[PDB]
């Protein structure tokens, strides 16, 4: 099979430091190549990080040309219409070529799916571990350090040939210098990391697909597309959390959407390769936890922690509208079948929280016979909230790494700048945009990020970092509670209890 312009997928170094192309998290723009951290054959836990859209060649000399500054200018106007318009140009010629195979010797784009951001190699800047590479970074909106050529490996394989599936490359910047190095190099707050970048070198690249532009369309059902599980009979989301310190399948008692209610789908492929559709197998990997769901003891919902076994497989069977030829599944409510243990899904009325008083947790096994009710609809999740949701835990982490280390000690001239812009950034994101975006200031707010920060223990980590210049950013720290609070009982409550406490 060929590669095409639209085509999903992964990118895996060769050679020196075999590895797969990862990124940390959301706020920071590190490229990284965790050697260690996983294999071509049993790839590394939160791959959905490791997978990448092609994109043709970016138009991008007028947006360039626009964002050249400490300057006056009325007419700024004119020229911020002019990138739009190109930008929009960019947009449909690059559509327009979804379904073209890309040969050798084409210069593409790699856009990062999780970050929604490309690869960006700073020809101005040296990588900050590699004495010698040029920097690079994630850019969302790209620029002339997001162009590639893509050229060909072994002699085999010669330019204009159709660049075909499980080649190895070299990615070489078009202007920008030195192919893509994975560098040998770790980092210091890293354990699982050697760092990327531009240099002379002869790293490889193999491209593995994770799904064709024929399959990249909506709203069909997807390889690594999130979905919340909604027992359409219960009215309840499937959830799976920790209670008692044991993790636990169960119904949490659509208004409400828990973030550990994030069900990441899988469909089965003899390759670690990612519609499917009913004549298909699943399983199904938790957000929070990379734990699997699956059954095993006539049979109950357990959460295994990885997806290497049977019984962590379940097909989906469809209705009302059954029986259903085979055929891309398109966000309908369906029947869970194990064929590993033979078995159809079947709620139950008995708590997992027993003491406490209209528990909130209804446990589920599997039962043998058909229900007419007993079937969930698989609910489609944005992909733009689910951004929200890395960043935002991924942040929390950000000031749970940080907070910890006023605690004890002090913090250093650099560790300071990130905080104190990360934070005014944390307020875009919960003020909601963005665009200068004075608009967005004005803008109204997002409940639903309002919903993430006690979730992710956004507003706990604020509170926490009151333990102990920082009359800017310990006084920063009161536009966003407040941003966050308005409106909301349940967030004004919690907030007035941690003040309290």
């Known amino acids: 099979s060929f590669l095409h312009i639209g085509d999903i997928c992964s990118l895996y170094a060769e050679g020196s430091t ?32 490791c997978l ?105 394989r010669s330019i204009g040939d159709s660049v075909v599936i499980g080649d190895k490359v070299v990615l070489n910047p078009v202007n920008a210098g030195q192919p893509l190095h994975a560098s040998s190099h770790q980092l210091v707050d890293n354990p699982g990391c050697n760092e990327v970048n531009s240099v002379n070198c002869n790293t490889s690249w193999k491209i593995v697909l994770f799904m064709k532009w024929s399959d990249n369309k909506d709203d069909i059902l997807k390889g690594g597309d999130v979905v919340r599980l909604f027992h359409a009979e219960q009215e309840k989301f499937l959830t799976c959390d920790e209670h008692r310190k044991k993790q636990h399948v169960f119904l949490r008692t659509t208004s409400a959407t828990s973030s550990k209610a994030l069900w990441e789908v899988e469909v089965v492929q003899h390759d670690p390769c990612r519609a499917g559709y009913w004549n298909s197998l699943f399983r199904f990997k938790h957000l929070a936890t990379g734990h699997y ?21 379940f097909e989906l069977d469809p209705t009302t509208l059954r029986g259903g030829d085979s055929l891309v599944p398109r966000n309908s409510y369906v029947r869970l079948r194990h064929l590993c243990t033979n078995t159809w899904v079947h709620s139950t009325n008995i708590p997992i929280d027993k ?66 812009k990360l934070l005014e950034d944390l307020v875009y994101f919960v003020t909601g945009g963005t665009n200068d975006v004075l608009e967005v200031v004005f803008s109204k707010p997002n409940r639903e990020r309002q919903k993430l920060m006690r979730e992710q223990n956004i507003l706990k980590q604020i509170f926490k970092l009151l333990q102990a210049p920082f009359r800017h950013i310990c006084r920063l720290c009161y536009r966003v509670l407040r941003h966050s609070q308005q409106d909301y009982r349940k967030n004004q409550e919690y907030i007035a209890k941690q003040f309290g406490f």
């Open 18 to 49: 075999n590895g797969f192309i990862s990124t940390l998290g959301l706020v920071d723009d590190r490229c990284v190549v965790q050697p260690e951290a996983g294999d071509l054959n049993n790839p590394p836990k939160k791959f959905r990080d």
């Open 52 to 156: 990448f859209k092609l994109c043709p060649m970016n138009r991008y000399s007028a947006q360039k040309q626009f964002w050249k500054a400490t300057t006056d200018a009325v007419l700024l106007n004119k020229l911020h219409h002019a990138a739009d318009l190109e930008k929009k140009q960019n947009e449909t010629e690059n559509r327009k070529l979804l379904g073209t195979v890309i040969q050798y010797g084409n210069v593409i784009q790699l856009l990062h799916l999780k970050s929604n951001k490309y690869l960006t190699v700073n020809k101005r800047l040296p990588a900050l571990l590699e004495k010698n590479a040029m920097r690079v970074t994630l850019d969302e909106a790209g620029n002339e350090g997001s162009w590639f050529y893509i050229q060909p490996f072994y002699k085999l």
């Open 355 to 420: 003491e406490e008083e209209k528990p909130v947790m209804l446990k589920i096994g599997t039962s043998p016979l058909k229900e007419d009710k007993e079937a969930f609809a698989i609910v489609p999740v944005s992909p733009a909230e689910v951004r929200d949701l890395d960043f935002a835990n991924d942040a929390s982490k950000v000031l749970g790494s940080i907070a910890g280390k006023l605690e004890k000690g002090t913090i250093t001239q650099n560790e300071r700048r990130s905080v104190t």
């Open 293 to 313: 769901l699956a059954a095993e003891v006539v049979y109950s919902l357990v959460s295994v922690p990885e997806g290497n076994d049977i019984s962590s497989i």
